[PDB]
Ligand SMILES: NC(=O)c1ccc[n+]([C@@H]2O[C@H](COP(=O)([O-])OP(=O)(O)OC[C@H]3O[C@@H](n4cnc5c(N)ncnc54)[C@H](OP(=O)(O)O)[C@@H]3O)[C@@H](O)[C@H]2O)c1
């Protein structure tokens with residue numbers, strides 16, 4: 216249950232989302248990541264940003280040590296945080312991610328966001344007032360440093376996240392390009408289905424990986440809590456009842472049937488296990504059309520600061 220990437224590697228089509236907000240104790244990532252592997256997840260999505268690479272890495276190691284899986288059966292992703300875009304910072308950031316997870320390699324390393332931030336030790340540098348401080352970096356040079364990380368074998372594959380079509384074209388048309396990104400990891404669910412970007416990615420043999428495929432964690436730091444709750448949608452709920460499944464499973468199956476690799480975050484043992492049931496049923500062509508019709512140009516992620524970033528991907 217994987218897709219072949221444009222570099223010859225293979226990515227499992229269902230991935231586990233490991234992000235939890237800062238209020239969650241760190242020991243939780245370790246617990247739930249083991250649970251996810253135990254349920255059947257083989258793709259595990261982490262990032263510098265998430266401040267959990269130690270614990271995710273330890274969960275991976277634990278399931279290798281206990282005999283359940285081999286290193287090569289797990290697809291582990293991490294990501295370069297936006298304070299580390301300047302090229303000289305990229306390999307050391309990857310090496311630090313590796314040290315924390317205690318892995319020799321990541322299966323995938325992504326540029327987390329095109330919205331470069333001021334370098335330093337803070338995740339979210341802010342000035343005098345409360346304002347997040349931006350940087351300016353030619354992301355083509357960040358990409359070249361990513362290429363070097365694949366060539367050294369530290370990342371098997373390299374890709375990007377939160378890129379729009381123009382930003383993907385920039386890399387695709389870089390003079391001297393060595394490796395195309397294998398994927399673009401983006402917000403994608405039935406209220407923001409990205410069909411036009413999906414078609415573009417497919418035209419270039421770039422996989423679209425969906426985040427917030429279940430409608431996001433709706434944390435009020437990023438998401439308006441009066442936005443509509445994806446999983447309460449009436450159409451997804453009628454489909455769930457028809458198939459004897461749940462709205463979440465309908466949302467995840469949708470993505471698989473359109474050629475999207477889909478992530479699913481849950482820190483609940485029963486929901487983690489429910490989500491692997493996505494492989495157990497199929498939606499009809501008419502089911503897919505109905506879900507297609509939910510699209511409403513809604514990105515849950517919203518930030519007045521980021522909206523002013525020159526590399527803001529939403530316009
Ligand atoms: N590249 C980026 O910028 C970026 C952005 C966002 C996300 N991501 C990645 O994508 C992963 C997932 O996206 P996300 O964090 O926004 O969460 P999500 O997958 O959209 O999940 C949203 C909420 O759905 C709930 N849930 C999960 N399975 C369910 C089910 N079977 N039935 C009812 N509810 C269910 C979870 O709550 P519970 O824990 O209570 O189950 C979760 O908090 C992240 O963890 C991260 O790895 C990347």
Ligand SMILES: O=C(O)c1cccc(S(=O)(=O)N2CCc3ccccc3C2)c1
Nearest residue numbers: 234262264327328377437516517518521
């Ligand atoms: O990787 C994630 O799980 C995640 C969680 C919280 C924030 C971010 S972020 O700061 O990288 N960023 C995602 C892209 C985006 C787009 C529009 C508005 C806000 C954000 C936040 C990413």
